[PDB]
Structure formats: structure tokens, C-alpha cells
Amino acid sequence: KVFGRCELAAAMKRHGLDNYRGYSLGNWVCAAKFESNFNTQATNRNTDGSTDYGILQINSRWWCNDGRTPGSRNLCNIPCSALLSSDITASVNCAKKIVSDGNGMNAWVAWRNRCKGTDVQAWIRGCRL
């Protein structure tokens, strides 16, 4: 599913992501824009052989099982395919565990490089929330 901007904002809010671990809703929207272009089916293979999945490009090295990433973990206890569903619940639940892991949103390289420090508020401007 390709979400619209304000549509994803409202789904993330409904799922408890606004100010989760202190990160305002715009940070989460901005990270999804640059990690997946708001597409839940986005997948990208990494050089180490792991793959990133879904709207927040969660990686199989640590967070989900895809059966093809040696020596990896599945800390969110889910098949990586769950992260590609039109329902964002699994991506949100897993992202809450990631962002509570110590490094905050820095776990998402695109957030650090394209959202951190910017006017993220712009991402939810105009939206009914």
C-alpha cells in the first residue's frame, strides 16, 4: 500500500507513535518518506546480505526473520513479510522496540541524514490529526 502523507501520519498516531520515546510525529513521517516513499511493500537488500522491509525499512540482521540472513536475530518475533502489509501494526510495534534500543531514531540512517535537525513539523502540516 502506498500511503498518502497525512494518511500515514494519522495511522502512525492511531498506533501510538506520536511522541513515542519523545519523537514527534513528524520525525516518524519524515523517516518513512525517505526510507520507503510511504510504500509498505518496499524492500532493499544490504551489502551484508540482510534486507530492509516496509515503511520504515526494518532490517533482517536483527529485527525480523526472512530465513536468508545468516546469524541474524528476530527481536521483533515476526516474519519480515509482516512488515510489508497494508496494516502497519507490525512495523509500528517493531519500530517501538528499535527506537527504545539505546540509539533512538539514529537506528534509521535516512532519519539521521535527512530528518534529524530539520523542520520535521512540516511533514504533518495541514493534516487532520
> Which of the residues 35, 48, 66, 119 is marked catalytic?
35
Residues 43-62, interacting with Na ion (CB under 5 A): 60
Determine whether 87 is an active site residue.
no
> Which of the residues 52, 66, 87, 119 is marked catalytic?
52
Coil, strand or helix at 6 = helix
Partner that binds at residue 104, options Na ion, Cl ion, none, CB closer than 5 to 8 Å by kind:
Cl ion
Measured CA to CA, the distance from residue 69 to residue 129 in angstroms comes to 39
Determine whether 7 is an active site residue.
no
Please state the φ and ψ torsions of residue 90, each to the nearest 5 degrees: -65, -40
Q: Which residue in the shown chain puts its C-beta closest to Na ion?
A: 72
Measured CA to CA, the distance from residue 112 to residue 101 in angstroms comes to 16
- Residues at the contact surface with Na ion, assessed by CB under 5 A: 60, 65, 69, 72, 74
